[PDB]
Design a binder for this molecule. Sequence first.
Ligand SMILES: O=C(Nc1ccc(-c2nnn[nH]2)cc1Cc1ccccc1)c1cccc(CC2CCCCC2)n1
Length: 190
Amino acid sequence: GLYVGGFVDVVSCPKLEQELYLDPDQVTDYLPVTEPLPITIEHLPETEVGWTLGLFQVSHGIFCTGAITSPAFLELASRLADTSHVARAPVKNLPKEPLLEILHTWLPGLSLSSIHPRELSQTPSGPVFQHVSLCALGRRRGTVAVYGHDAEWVVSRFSSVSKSERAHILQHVSSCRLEDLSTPNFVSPL
Ligand SMILES: O=C(Nc1ccc(-c2nnn[nH]2)cc1Cc1ccccc1)c1cccc(CC2CCCCC2)n1
């Protein structure tokens, strides 16, 4: 399996003219989000690679846990990890887990798409959040994303998340199962 975790940036209209990064306190009333949102790359809808497992308010911000489940993506990324000089160039030499290191390096940002704050003054009508994207650019408040084969290992890499908060996060990561979720839409260009 592949899991991803980290603190997110909250962004309205990502990659558009009206792009607006939100202070996390503007959306904490609408957390936690336990139901799965798509995980895409750089806010491109045709690059779904997995599903979120939880978005939680913790002390230092908003933490996301996700599962990367697309077999096409996993196979392609693993192959590039083992064969692509470009993918490996900016990573430490000869890592034991090249797929994890390449993802951590090339897609360090977690970006949570939100509706615009004007919708949050009142009571919003529909879903406040749309998706989480793995991003090469745009990280501000978010931390560098951690990729791993177990969810416990991934969350345990953030010393800024208490054992207590870790337990709360991992509680739901285990409750909401993955196998039943639909296959993400990513198509390998190879
Ligand atoms: O421009 C990028 N990639 C890119 C562009 C064109 C084609 C391509 N077009 N035609 N044939 N191949 C193929 C790829 C590789 C790709 C593979 C898996 C998911 C999306 C992209 C790009 C830029 C920044 C970050 C990333 C994330 C990558 C994730 C997997 C490991 C390597 C980094 N990718």
